[PDB]
């Protein structure tokens, strides 16, 4: 009976709320109150990557920390050599409305998708010498919002149709579908071990998924608006989400609740991207306001600002060795900061 | 050799310059409308599980790419942001005196959106023949859904479009005034609304868009060539 099930849902919600409030014996802020402040950290633009005709929507670092792919909505991916600013590759896309791109951890493939509802895999190591579309994964009924490689053969995607998916690239069909979100899934982050991944999905909730079983381990709430960005903490036991309510928020999987919130009264614009430094002490968040902010993830005070983009900061990413952070903006530039 | 890599980068950049020329000289339009609007027929008259459709046509040797969302959910507040750089939004609305208020709200949201706040809207008050028939029949009254229409009278400067009843003229100009009031309520001038009374049969539609794009681009040139 519908009303009976509603009562049961409310009772279970209250039970979960009480269970997670009982564990809130302290706060991250209180426990970190005695830790030495990070101080004001200043980052300078070491490189500016020019060549995209339109706004950049996504970028991803290679695992070697030197090559990085960026997607722009002129319908083009560019593989840059960040050390020299050389354009290693330029891949024209069939659909110009790309909203995400990914770099395979082996470096053999890139992935990209968008309003076409398709995730195209491009092979970077063709014997012909040219980059080719190895596969194009169809089956999402909404625009492709994010995609991350688990492996040369497995890719996890999210879409505006409210579902995530795990694909078998060789067969090109959905090995698993992850359902439970009620809004557009705006981002996903893969855990370091690639056994779990979190997703933020335009319903003010983040969800933790186990790829092998294929269902939601946990649901985290506390954001007041759509979540645009989500990133896993380096040790994999926590993650950070940025939302349209102009705040970042750090959740802990084991405590199953919010641990911290990064917000300042002068910031009244949405957050487009988030990332952690290698140690996890710095949380770098890009904003609809044209500059990124670097937060002390332990004390949640603004440790610095990356200003220098003339438009919306759309994408943000730290290298695997932590040497630099790339920020790509709607002004069609990527800037490497150090 | 690093020099060979730099030479490859330079060749990539040359190709990118060619693509930049082609990209700059082509005009991109976003076609929006509800189910009842005849935007599909407008697309079908522009000739010469996918989430987006492109129709590329040409007028006086200038190329237009018009994009219409396909398989998407009705929550548009995220993918609409992808179109903050198009030259115009062709917003098609059915004159069905009732979905008119829903269309007005759609137009208002498109108009006041932060990322679409500099995009001009070409407004097609589509299906004018149906509006004329519905007004002449007299069975449905606009006052039921827009009581302010009880006080409305056609402005003197309004074009008569001869052969047209005063009643249908009053109705159509009130409907146009609703959208124009929404568009002028902003008080910024960053972008303009270009209303048109159209029917999907209209062969003039393409030309209309062209004549509107000429204006929109002109407004950009005024700023790009230091004339304002």
């Amino acid at each position, epitope marked *: 009976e519908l009303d009976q099930l509603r009562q049961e849902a409310e009772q279970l919600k209250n039970q979960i709320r009480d269970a997670r409030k009982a564990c809130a014996d302290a706060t991250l802020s209180q426990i970190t109150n005695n830790i030495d402040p990070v101080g004001r950290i200043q980052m300078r633009t070491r490189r500016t990557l020019r060549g995209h005709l339109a706004k950049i929507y996504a970028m991803h670092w290679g695992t070697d920390s030197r090559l990085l792919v960026s997607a722009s909505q002129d319908g083009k991916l560019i593989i840059w050599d960040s050390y020299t600013t050389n354009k*290693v590759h330029a891949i024209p896309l069939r659909s110009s409305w790309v909203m995400t791109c990914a770099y395979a951890p082996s470096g053999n493939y890139v992935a990209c998708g968008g309003l076409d509802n398709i995730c195209s895999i491009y092979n970077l190591k063709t014997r012909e*010498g040219n980059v080719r579309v190895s596969r194009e994964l169809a089956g999402h009924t909404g625009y492709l919002s994010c995609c991350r490689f688990l492996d040369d053969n497995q890719i996890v995607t999210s879409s505006g149709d409210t579902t995530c998916a795990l694909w078998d690239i060789e067969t090109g069909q959905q090995t698993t579908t992850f359902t439970g979100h009620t809004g557009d899934v705006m981002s996903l982050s893969l855990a370091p071990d690639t056994r779990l991944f979190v997703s933020g999905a335009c319903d003010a909730s983040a969800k933790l998924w186990d790829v092998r079983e294929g269902m939601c381990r946990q649901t985290f709430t506390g954001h007041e608006s759509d979540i645009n960005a989500i990133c896993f903490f380096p040790n994999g036991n926590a993650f950070a989400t940025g939302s349209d309510d102009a705040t970042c928020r750090l959740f802990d999987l084991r405590a199953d609740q919010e641990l911290m919130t990064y917000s300042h009264d002068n910031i009244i614009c949405g957050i487009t991207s988030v990332s952690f430094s290698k140690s996890g002490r710095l949380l770098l968040a890009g904003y609809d306001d044209f500059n990124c902010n670097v937060w002390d993830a332990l004390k949640a005070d603004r440790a610095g600002v990356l200003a220098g983009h003339d438009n919306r900061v759309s994408c943000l990413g730290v290298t695997d060795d932590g040497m630099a952070v790339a920020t790509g903006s709607w002004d069609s530039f990527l800037k490497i900061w150090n | 050799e690093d020099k060979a890599a730099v*030479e490859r980068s330079k060749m990539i950049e040359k190709q990118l310059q060619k693509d930049k020329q082609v990209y700059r000289r082509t005009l991109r339009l976003l076609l929006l409308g509800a189910d009842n609007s005849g935007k599909s027929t407008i697309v079908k008259q522009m000739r010469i599980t996918s989430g987006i459709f492109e129709t590329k046509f040409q007028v006086d040797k200038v190329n237009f790419h018009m994009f219409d969302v396909g398989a998407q959910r009705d929550e548009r507040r995220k993918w609409i942001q992808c179109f903050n750089d198009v030259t115009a939004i062709i917003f098609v609305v059915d004159s069905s005196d009732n979905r008119l208020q829903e269309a007005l709200n759609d137009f208002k949201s498109i108009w006041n959106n932060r990322w679409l706040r500099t995009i001009s809207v070409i407004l097609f008050l589509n299906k004018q023949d149906l509006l004329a028939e519905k007004v002449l029949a007299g069975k449905s009254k606009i006052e039921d859904y827009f009581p302010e229409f009880a006080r409305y009278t056609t402005p003197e400067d309004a074009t008569p479009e001869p052969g047209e009843d005063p009643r249908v003229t009053r109705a159509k100009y009130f409907i146009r005034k609703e959208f124009v009031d929404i568009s002028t309520a902003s008080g910024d001038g960053r972008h303009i609304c270009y209303p048109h009374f159209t029917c999907s049969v209209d062969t003039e539609n393409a030309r209309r868009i062209f004549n509107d794009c000429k204006d929109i681009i002109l407004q950009m040139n005024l700023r790009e060539y230091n004339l304002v």
Partner: single-chain antibody
Amino acid sequence: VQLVESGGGLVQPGGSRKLSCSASGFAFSSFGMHWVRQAPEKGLEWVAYISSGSGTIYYADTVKGRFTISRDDPKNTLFLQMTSLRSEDTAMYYCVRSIYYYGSSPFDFWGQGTTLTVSAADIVMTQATSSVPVTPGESVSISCRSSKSLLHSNGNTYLYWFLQRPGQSPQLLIYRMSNLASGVPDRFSGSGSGTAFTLTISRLEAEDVGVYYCMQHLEYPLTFGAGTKLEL
């Protein structure tokens, strides 16, 4: 991928000729191309190079001013005009594709070669031994030395190991002194110290016999070694 050369044969000294090469099965326009000769009974020697886009052209000093390298990308062809041919110009000429970008492997594919007969400051690369007796299943090492240090300031060590089997064109084994080429078994390994280099084959398999050649891509004139012969 295929590279087929033609235009060889016998020619009188002081004459002129046109070697041609048709490329198929790969994006010819995006690959730089080299001409590399091999004397009837001696080692490899680089002849000429034309970059992708034809923006850069290099010739070996021994042939500079006499040979002219050109390419027709729409026809997927590479041409080498030769004039004032001397006696030393008799050799089998190989066309070798090579693509340059971060992490690429140049000199990866070699043509079948066309034979040409003529009627009757550089970095010197030296391989320790011309010959070494081997038997299947054993472990063998090949040594190489260079006048200059092939280690560059950017960290790359520009040494390449090629293997030429009897009757076959050379195939890339190692590029940049430590990277295995596509399709090369794990048996082969490359290492070195900038000025001296070693290629080790573990549990030598049949068909690994042949001449191993060293090459340096550090500076404009590409130079090969004398070659080291492995036979059963």
